[PDB]
Chains A and B, each alone.
Chain A
Amino acid sequence: AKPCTVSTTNATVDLGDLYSFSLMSAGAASAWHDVALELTNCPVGTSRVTASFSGAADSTGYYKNQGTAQNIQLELQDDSGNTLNTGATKTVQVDDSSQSAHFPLQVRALTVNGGATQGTIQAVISITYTYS
């Protein structure tokens, strides 16, 4: 099927400042932060959009922090609590009243094993769309 227009080229999640004091214990984490991916002007005949997610993972399975803080990871979920680690896909239905599609996702930082250290948090997740 024909591709939609990708309205969301770029989407930034600002997790703010986390404190090593607060991230001493395993499983400590930031709040979830919403991030949306939007597609518009889907051709007639396009009824489903699949997003494929890719980014560097560490040995915890979650996304690697590519900033300087150690012992912290990034987690991407859908709207329903499902983890979308690298290689995951998600499919949504095109809304035929507007011929648009959306991916309501959420991101947080977490220290899987505890002991996050001072430094930056930086990560990027690439999305490729397929259509049917």
Chain B
Amino acid sequence: ADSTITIRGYVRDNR
């Protein structure tokens, strides 16, 4: 509503 916290990232799996 008044504020929005956006969280972003990535989980990488190189196996």
Name A residues whose Cβ lies closer than 8 Å to a Cβ of B.
6, 8-21, 23, 30, 35, 37, 51, 63, 67, 69, 72, 74, 76, 105, 107, 109, 116-129
Contacts and interface: CB of A to CB of B under 8 A. Distances in A.
B10 A17 contact: yes
Contacts, number: 105
A121 B3 CA distance: 20
A19 B14 CA distance: 8
Interface of B: 1-15
Q: Which 3 A-B pairs have the closest CB atoms?
A: A15-B9, A20-B13, A118-B13
B7 A121 contact: yes
A8 B10 CA distance: 25
